[PDB]
Amino acid sequence: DPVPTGGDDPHKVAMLGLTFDDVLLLPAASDVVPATADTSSQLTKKIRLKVPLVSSAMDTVTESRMAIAMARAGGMGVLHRNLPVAEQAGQVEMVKRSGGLLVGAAVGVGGDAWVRAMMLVDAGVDVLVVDTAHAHNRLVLDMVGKLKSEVGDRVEVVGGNVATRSAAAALVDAGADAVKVGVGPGSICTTRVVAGVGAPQITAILEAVAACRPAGVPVIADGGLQYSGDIAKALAAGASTAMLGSLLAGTAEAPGELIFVNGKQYKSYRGMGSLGAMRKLVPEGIEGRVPFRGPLSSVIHQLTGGLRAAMGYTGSPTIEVLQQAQFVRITPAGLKESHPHDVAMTVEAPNYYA
Amino acid sequence: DPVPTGGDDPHKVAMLGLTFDDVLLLPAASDVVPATADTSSQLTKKIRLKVPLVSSAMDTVTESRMAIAMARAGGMGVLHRNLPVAEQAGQVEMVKRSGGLLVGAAVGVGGDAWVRAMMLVDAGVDVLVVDTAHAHNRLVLDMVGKLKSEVGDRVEVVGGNVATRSAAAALVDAGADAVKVGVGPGSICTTRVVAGVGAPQITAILEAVAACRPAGVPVIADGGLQYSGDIAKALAAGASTAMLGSLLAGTAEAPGELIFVNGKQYKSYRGMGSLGAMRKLVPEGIEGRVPFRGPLSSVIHQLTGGLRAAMGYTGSPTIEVLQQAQFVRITPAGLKESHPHDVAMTVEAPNYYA
Amino acid sequence: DPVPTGGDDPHKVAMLGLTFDDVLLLPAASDVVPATADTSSQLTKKIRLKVPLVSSAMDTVTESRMAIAMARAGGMGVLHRNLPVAEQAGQVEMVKRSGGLLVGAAVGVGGDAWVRAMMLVDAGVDVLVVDTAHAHNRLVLDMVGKLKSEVGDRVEVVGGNVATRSAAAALVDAGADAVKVGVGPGSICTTRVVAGVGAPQITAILEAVAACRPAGVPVIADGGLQYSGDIAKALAAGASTAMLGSLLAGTAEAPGELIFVNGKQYKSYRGMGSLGAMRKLVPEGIEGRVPFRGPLSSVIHQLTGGLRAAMGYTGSPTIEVLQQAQFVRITPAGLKESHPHDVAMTVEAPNYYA
Amino acid sequence: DPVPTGGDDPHKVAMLGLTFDDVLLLPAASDVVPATADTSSQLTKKIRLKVPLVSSAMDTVTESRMAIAMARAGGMGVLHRNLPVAEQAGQVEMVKRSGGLLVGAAVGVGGDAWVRAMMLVDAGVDVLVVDTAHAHNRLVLDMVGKLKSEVGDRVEVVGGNVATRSAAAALVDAGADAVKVGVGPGSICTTRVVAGVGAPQITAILEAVAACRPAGVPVIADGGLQYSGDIAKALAAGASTAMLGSLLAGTAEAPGELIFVNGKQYKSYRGMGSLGAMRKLVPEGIEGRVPFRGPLSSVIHQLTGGLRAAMGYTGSPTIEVLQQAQFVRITPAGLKESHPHDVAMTVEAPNYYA
Ligand SMILES: COc1c(C)c2c(c(O)c1C/C=C(\C)Cn1cc(COC[C@H]3O[C@@H](n4cnc5c(N)ncnc54)[C@H](O)[C@@H]3O)nn1)C(=O)OC2
Ligand SMILES: COc1c(C)c2c(c(O)c1C/C=C(\C)Cn1cc(COC[C@H]3O[C@@H](n4cnc5c(N)ncnc54)[C@H](O)[C@@H]3O)nn1)C(=O)OC2
Ligand SMILES: COc1c(C)c2c(c(O)c1C/C=C(\C)Cn1cc(COC[C@H]3O[C@@H](n4cnc5c(N)ncnc54)[C@H](O)[C@@H]3O)nn1)C(=O)OC2
Ligand SMILES: COc1c(C)c2c(c(O)c1C/C=C(\C)Cn1cc(COC[C@H]3O[C@@H](n4cnc5c(N)ncnc54)[C@H](O)[C@@H]3O)nn1)C(=O)OC2
Numbered sequence A, B, C, D: 001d002p003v004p005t006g007g008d009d010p011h012k013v014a015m016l017g018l019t020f021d022d023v024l025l026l027p028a029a030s031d032v033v034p035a036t037a038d039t040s041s042q043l044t045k046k047i048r049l050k051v052p053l054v055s056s057a058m059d060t061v062t063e064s065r066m067a068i069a070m071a072r073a074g075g076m077g078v079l080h081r082n083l084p085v086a087e088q089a090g091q092v093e094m095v096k097r098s099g100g101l102l103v104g105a106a107v108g109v110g111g112d113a114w115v116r117a118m119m120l121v122d123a124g125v126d127v128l129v130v131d132t133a134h135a136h137n138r139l140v141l142d143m144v145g146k147l148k149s150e151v152g153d154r155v156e157v158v159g160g161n162v163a164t165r166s167a168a169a170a171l172v173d174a175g176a177d178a179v180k181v182g183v184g185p186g187s188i189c190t191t192r193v194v195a196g197v198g199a200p201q202i203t204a205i206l207e208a209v210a211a212c213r214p215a216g217v218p219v220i221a222d223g224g225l226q227y228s229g230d231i232a233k234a235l236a237a238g239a240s241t242a243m244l245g246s247l248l249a250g251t252a253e254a255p256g257e258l259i260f261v262n263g264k265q266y267k268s269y270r271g272m273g274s275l276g277a278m279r280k281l282v283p284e285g286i287e288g289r290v291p292f293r294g295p296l297s298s299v300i301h302q303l304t305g306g307l308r309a310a311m312g313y314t315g316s317p318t319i320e321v322l323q324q325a326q327f328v329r330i331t332p333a334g335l336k337e338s339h340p341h342d343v344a345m346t347v348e349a350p351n352y353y354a
């Protein structure tokens, strides 16, 4: 970062971090229309999805109903781990016996996490996600490496989360089959406020990709996505898939009863590091609610439609070509101009609410 | 773009995009006053307007009443294409038989669009606008080139929309008589959110102009304009005309009945890519309403008055000289200072509402 | 401006404009306390004020009561010109016969303005202000030069307004005794929106000063000031005095009756380019109201107290040394941190309202 | 500062100032977990705290109850000086006789301040804080140097406040045992608005540290902190401790009765430069209220928990290693993404309110 901002060390403030709202994809020469785009992409080294989307491993987003629906829509669910091992394993079996659908499951770090992992593999899980706030901790890299050693022939092992090139490189050397990027950008996340730590999500992807791409390891962009265009941006920055919590938490298939506050409909959505999920603790998430959004299938159709539009605009027949697209950086005025502006919206759009 | 923002490719984030609110025109030495300014400008290679303004080809902005009024005010209307071919053609005839006024009409891409185009030419249209979200698609360049080949002796052919230098260059090589710039900046547009694609409108004009100006092809700045000063900025960036939807949709001549909500008056205004206009679809516009603004003539007087003021300030006797003016880039504080600030407005101004 | 923002001309977007909220003064080594600071400064080549403040030539800010009070407080008023010549001249006499106080008066450009000017000189005015939106117009430079030729032995002649180095240089060569800077930053001004023209006020001062300082011509910073700290910033950027409209319009001495809306007290304040002041016109100002602020003397005490504080902080015993102080440029976060933040204000401060 | 912003002097606008919301800490390789972090740090050359936090010397933040509680929590209180000397001294004795707890006390500059200081030393104070708005004034450096000469064997002497490298260097040469950084960032402070003076707090720390670190003098980051992550940022920028007013003013131990406005609970909090504290004056602070936050111990637990999280993320076993961490600079979009976003919070978190 060139500009003088204090002190005598030019590396103290090491770069300028961008996130989704900071950039637009540039249109390019195209012989692609949304209809002819191919949205398939690698979830891991061995697993390719038809639709490059996976649901967050959260107790207000993914249990078996969500996992089943995501798989049928061409993506995948990652089953959360805030429940007894026998119950998480049973949910893996529920998905597996609905057509041999793909499914993943989260585990932590340690002895209990290891027992959880072995049970999940026994239940037939396809992907284990080592699900942590900071994968550059040595204990996490150990967990990833040992799982890959012991069961890596039977199962794919994802490691996360990271926000730097060096952390992505450490997970690759540990043997990760994919690397999940996102420290702090989650809609329900307070890590960046409470700890003061993280990196803006576009820059975090660009950096992780610089480590993972040359090693042939897919990057999963996790957190901070709010519009279908954000998915296109994350993939163009080099991710192969995107993980969604907020965008899916409001759907019929997410766990939770409908909340009916003041004429409107909502579903609860909460961080896994919130007090409520963990039950003095120092939480790194909040508890809240999102608008009810109806069937998962209709949300995914809108998201994939927006991604297909982006592929047509950028002349990308495949996700692999989308990953080569270019950005322009924009100002606050640019962002206001990008949204609808100076008009009163009178009708809801299925892919846009202010 | 010099500053490090992630990864190892300096061309990934290729430049900084500016739009109207990011810049001001610098005053210069002047022997021009608003009264003596000459606002005429090229719409196309062959067509010069007295006032460098054209109304959007939208079903809530331009049918024959709007086209007639815009022509009489010294500009032009582009008749929308969300209606049967015989009806669009009939409206062209309505305008033509009100004094031989100039008129344009939108067409799409394909066989039905081609039949539409031939009928419009037969009705006496002066300008065909190949009206698309992404003119850098090969199908659009083909449509432009074939129209120019078949009927280009009888009619001027405009192509759009683009947001890059390379896309403008492709339209010029395809034979466009003008190039329309604007991917996503429209007030009712969600393309930049839904697809994540576009470029801020001042930068988009500067880039398109770098391709079109040396080839002698006029650029039409389309979308994102909200104040008379925006028109001056778009022209100074090198456009020859500006296309307006939002600013004209509220006028008496725009299609639509007056809406009377809660003591106030409005007219409907909607994207042509909204669900409502297209009638599961994945829309790229919204449906809404804008304040009623009275007769078109009075709006155009205010817009041209603001443009004339800019010409006096920049010492520009003609639009061609305005296109040589300089900008200063501004911060959010600069923008707040540019608007009225720290005062409660007690009376409406005819050319300013907060 | 180094960063790529579109096109092939590096001078198209010629620099980055800053205004007051973009910068802070850096504290420095000091043997000055607010009590020992000397706030005197040149209004013009020949006229030094005890307090570097002058009231705007506006019909809601300065008639004779305001002019008298400003002079007694150690500054000066400039009498507005939206009234018959005999009446403006009479007000000059009212001030002159209240102790031989300093007074200025605005005039325009042309034959009627020239008659106005001669009458004002006859009435004993000390300063003529050629009061225009764009002093880089040739007609204005002619007016300034001819006044200085004809009556420049009897009276000081101020010219404005400008926002560029070249325009300030032209006024200096025309013979101006001071140069007034400010195109568009006024609180009631819409020029930057309606015409799209101007330059952020700190940059406008820095540029004008680069022309005026080496010629020994004082710069008057006109418009955009809202806090006592803004006065210190304008002077540190190199201005010698500041002109205030909004900050003084609410005082007892400003023309206007008190407005009592919904339990509170206000006074009308309006641009001289508003429809109301000019009485289809294309206005460049709005009509509004500001909070009532009580006696002028108490406002000026607060403003000078804040300026004296700045002088103590920067180690400036005199305004001439304050003009050598340094800035740091700040971000939106910096600006939020500069104001009170994260607290509910329960008591009014005499020099701060949110 | 490279970019052209006006005039011909590249040093006029000398750098870009950042504050807390402008930066995030980058995660790094770590063998630290929050539990194993060591939060101890130097308050002064001779005094090490277990927890790197000290309460502001304000009459709505620190009297003896607060000083006692802060010391027991592993930090320190600085007793305010808006009260008679015998009473401030008595409060020092109250703290000293509650277990020989550490305590500091503020003094001003001059003869009365000197008498106050001698009485405080006699009462057994551990730290004298020369408590001023501008320590680069020569009178302040004299006060610091004379105290260190006369009583510097018995007591540690802190000097502040500063916002520049040169001012920190002057205090070091004057003999300060620590340097307090912060000109204007306080939540109740208006200095930056009223005087227009200051520097954004991250840059102010980086600059002061460049002077103090090589001389082995600890820096106290004072003002502007609102979240536990801010404490981690201030320390990573090189401060050794942080001083808090706003974050502690709402606690049970802060002076003040509970205010019960409209169903909610608050405590008064006011600048020491506000009219109310000083009792025409020209104040540099405001009077207000903050939410009631319960026992001090629980607030400090949340703050230290967030700091420990940051240490785990950055791989810092000690504060000395945290001081070597790196930042990424972020945009407004980055800041929105850092907070919770696009969710309605339904439950209060103990370490986060919007
Ligand atoms: C046409 O109205 C606009 C305009 C003018 C703009 C936008 C927009 O979203 C819309 C709404 C979009 C539609 C109403 C849908 N539509 C219809 C057409 C007519 O031309 C269709 C042809 O345009 C090309 N095309 C149109 N969209 C794409 C895409 N997403 N990817 C690749 N090619 C695309 C393709 O060759 C196709 O055959 N273009 N967009 C916009 O973002 O900036 C300008
Ligand atoms: C005079 O009040 C201001 C002032 C001081 C400012 C502004 C403004 O809009 C106004 C309101 C504008 C008016 C009340 C209209 N007006 C009257 C005059 C008196 O001088 C008129 C002469 O000023 C020159 N002039 C004034 N405006 C222009 C222009 N737009 N283009 C070219 N020349 C212009 C021209 O030579 C003309 O003969 N200037 N503006 C402003 O934006 O920054 C400063
Ligand atoms: C003391 O509280 C603060 C503190 C800590 C800060 C600020 C502040 O406005 C205030 C409020 C200001 C006052 C309560 C007034 N005050 C009293 C003192 C005690 O020391 C007084 C001495 O401090 C020096 N000093 C204090 N202010 C100035 C100034 N504006 N210009 C030059 N010198 C100044 C000068 O030598 C003077 O003898 N400093 N400010 C601030 O902006 O950042 C830190
Ligand atoms: C797990 O959920 C997340 C995720 C995915 C993210 C975040 C987050 O705050 C949370 C909430 C945090 C928790 C629910 C707490 N938790 C539990 C785990 C499971 O793995 C624990 C292991 O992860 C490592 N670890 C986890 N947090 C830290 C830290 N602050 N410092 C050092 N190491 C840390 C450490 O080795 C530890 O043994 N990670 N965070 C986040 O900010 O970005 C991604």
Ligand SMILES: O=c1[nH]cnc2c1ncn2[C@@H]1O[C@H](COP(=O)(O)O)[C@@H](O)[C@H]1O
Pocket (backbone or CB within 6 Å): A056, A057, A058, A161, A182, A184, A185, A186, A187, A188, A189, A190, A191, A222, A223, A224, A225, A243, A244, A245, A246, A247, A270, A271, A272, A273, A274, A284, A285, A286
């Ligand atoms: O409590 C937490 N604190 C921080 N991040 C969390 C927490 N719980 C889940 N996450 C992350 O936030 C992501 C969802 O982000 P969203 O799509 O923006 O709502 C998840 O996939 C996790 O990576």
Ligand SMILES: O=c1[nH]cnc2c1ncn2[C@@H]1O[C@H](COP(=O)(O)O)[C@@H](O)[C@H]1O
Pocket (backbone or CB within 6 Å): B056, B057, B058, B161, B182, B184, B185, B186, B187, B188, B189, B190, B191, B222, B223, B224, B225, B243, B244, B245, B246, B247, B270, B271, B272, B273, B274, B284, B285, B286
């Ligand atoms: O639904 C749509 N989505 C995106 N852009 C549209 C749509 N309909 C019209 N437009 C564009 O928006 C322009 C009007 O923008 P406005 O002047 O900012 O309201 C039109 O001239 C078209 O280029």
Ligand SMILES: O=c1[nH]cnc2c1ncn2[C@@H]1O[C@H](COP(=O)(O)O)[C@@H](O)[C@H]1O
Pocket (backbone or CB within 6 Å): C056, C057, C058, C161, C182, C184, C185, C186, C187, C188, C189, C190, C191, C222, C223, C224, C225, C243, C244, C245, C246, C247, C270, C271, C272, C273, C274, C284, C285, C286
């Ligand atoms: O109607 C107008 N349009 C633009 N600027 C104006 C108008 N009337 C007065 N001004 C300028 O605005 C200044 C006052 O700005 P303020 O102190 O920010 O309210 C005056 O001294 C004039 O330079």
Ligand SMILES: O=c1[nH]cnc2c1ncn2[C@@H]1O[C@H](COP(=O)(O)O)[C@@H](O)[C@H]1O
Pocket (backbone or CB within 6 Å): D056, D057, D058, D161, D182, D184, D185, D186, D187, D188, D189, D190, D191, D222, D223, D224, D225, D243, D244, D245, D246, D247, D270, D271, D272, D273, D274, D284, D285, D286
């Ligand atoms: O009235 C004042 N004006 C300016 N700063 C003050 C005033 N009173 C206290 N301060 C500073 O503000 C700090 C507290 O800031 P806070 O933690 O952001 O609320 C104190 O420790 C002092 O350095």
Ligand SMILES: [K+]
Pocket (backbone or CB within 6 Å): A337, A338, A339, A340, A341, B184, B185, B186, B187, B188, B189, B190, B191, B192
């Ligand atoms: K838009």
Ligand SMILES: [K+]
Pocket (backbone or CB within 6 Å): B337, B338, B339, B340, B341, C184, C185, C186, C187, C188, C189, C190, C191, C192
């Ligand atoms: K303004």
Ligand SMILES: [K+]
Pocket (backbone or CB within 6 Å): C337, C338, C339, C340, C341, D184, D185, D186, D187, D188, D189, D190, D191, D192
């Ligand atoms: K402040």
Ligand SMILES: [K+]
Pocket (backbone or CB within 6 Å): A184, A185, A186, A187, A188, A189, A190, A191, A192, D337, D338, D339, D340, D341
């Ligand atoms: K967040």
